[PDB]
């Protein structure tokens, strides 16, 4: 009677530990359901996307001493799926000069019905928040690069403007590219 | 020693029941959040379906659930964040005599890029469902008021129509403001 | 020992309530996906995957697409696909229909539903799509205000030949996946 009541208390201990672990993976299942919902909210479907970057100097320091991806957006509800990739202290020819800003073609659930290569011309803006003089760059994709044909990974490799904006000019009194430690980047894809 | 173990399980079972409680909470408001994503608008006009009108009217006729908040809606994807606040049994100068309907400027993720104060003209409609004049009011919000400065908390104080529509006519035979215990409120915020 | 058993009760209570929390997760997950799927300009695109599989189980039933809407506050609609076919078309044709659903705002909308409907089975290569269309008639039960969750479906039996579906000459099916587009006019 004694040792059997002991075995019962011990299987209760094991069933409590087990419930603790099942509870943990229902919580992160809940987590990325939450993120699924967030990317639904942040997403645009007209080919204009606006990227609010908070805590700006913190992540610039951390870039100095790595790369950020935007929430996904779309050229149309049934068009191309894109996101942005931002190097706060630069990449490529702008390894430490500039903000380096690229588009990433992602694989969309309808890629079978769209033209390949992605040819759409892309316009990037760093928004001046007090004046209206935004810093603007633009390009048409280098045709057929493995950045721009149809993805067989969930993202192609990024392509764009590695010298989109130099860090020196970033906090000049003449503009407000950063305000309250926040920067706004705007991307316009033509449809 | 079995005393320590039975008490160590008593503490762990109460522990797991509370964490299970907060995953149930969290899932329930994830659920609510998804619904508020469904009802969100991005054109500056919002349509508010309020069901169980007789219930919720004599609800607010107790000290109970006096005011309703609409899901948030927006002038544009990157524009002002708004919601509506409805007193089914009235507030202020229309307490117990009118539905009182207000707009709430909320703090949006892009407020940094928009003109302040918020100035768009605001239109409220109580919609008659059967082919008759809707009850309509509108206003241009006044600039000197803190309801329209740039939000410093999650919401400014509401502003609107405390005497928007009188309760006696709400379920009037001659109108269809309530039909099958349902009413529709429409807000059109004029976009520049 | 009685406290042992009361703890076993509370432990099993925790387990089953947990499983309930799983099925809640699943239903909310699907709600989210139905939201992603939805469109609001009266044009909807339905990607069906694993086509050969679901044909073999069609012959072994019908699919409903996610809901879409003519506008934010307009008609709620969906599509009904028999991959094995219905009526004139049963076992020979794709039978594709539109389904008027009870919309949150039906009391505010004109009835009967009057908008033209076009069905397209899309060839994933440059040109030819299988296009069919119709304008609803006043009097059919498919197009009046729903007084249940869905009206009786209306559309295109014989909308496309089961034979020609996987012909090597057109890409209506490719990577075991087909795309149907519905265009409701506004």
Residue numbers in the entry:
A (entry chain B): 221 to 285, 289 to 414
B (entry chain A): 224 to 415
C (entry chain C): 226 to 285, 289 to 414
What does the report in the manuscript say about this coordinate set?
TNF-receptor associated factor (TRAF) proteins are key intracellular signaling molecules in the tumor necrosis receptor (TNFR) and toll like receptor (TLR) family signaling pathways that play critical roles in the immune system. TRAF1 is a well-known adaptor molecule that regulates the activation of NF-kappaB and JNK1516. TRAF1 is considered a unique family among TRAFs in that it lacks the N-terminal RING finger domain that is critical for relaying the signal to downstream effectors. The TRAF domain, which is composed of 7–8 anti-parallel β-strand folds followed by a coiled-coil region that mediates protein interactions, usually forms mushroom-like trimeric structures in solution.
The 2.8 Å crystal structure of the TRAF domain (corresponding to amino acids 220–416) consisting of the TRAF-N coiled-coil domain and the TRAF-C anti-parallel β-sandwich domain was solved using the molecular replacement (MR) method and refined to Rwork = 21.0% and Rfree = 26.2%. The structure of the TRAF1 TRAF domain revealed that TRAF-C comprises two α-helices (α1–α2) and six β-sheets (β1–β8). β2 and β7, which have been shown at other TRAF structures, were not detected and were replaced by the loop structure in the TRAF1 structure. The structure of the trimeric TRAF1 TRAF domain exhibited a typical mushroom shape, in which the TRAF domain forms the cap and the coiled-coil domain forms the stalk. The trimeric interface of the TRAF1 TRAF-N coiled-coil domain is primarily formed by several hydrophobic patches and two salt bridge clusters. The major force for formation of the trimeric interfaces of the TRAF1 TRAF-C domain was several hydrogen bonds formed between Glu261, Leu270 and Lys272 from one TRAF molecule (chain B) and Lys300, Tyr301, Glu332 and Tyr333 from the second molecule (chain A). Analysis by size-exclusion chromatography and MALS indicated that the TRAF1 TRAF domain exists as a trimer in solution, while the TRAF1 TRAF-C domain without the TRAF-N coiled-coil domain exists as a monomer in solution, indicating that the TRAF-N coiled-coil domain is critical for trimer formation of TRAF1. Pair-wise structural alignments between the TRAF1 TRAF domain and other TRAF domains showed that the position and length of several loops in the TRAF1 TRAF domain differed from those of other TRAF domains. Finally, we produced F325D, S368R, and R308D mutations to analyse the interaction sites on TRAF1 and performed ITC.
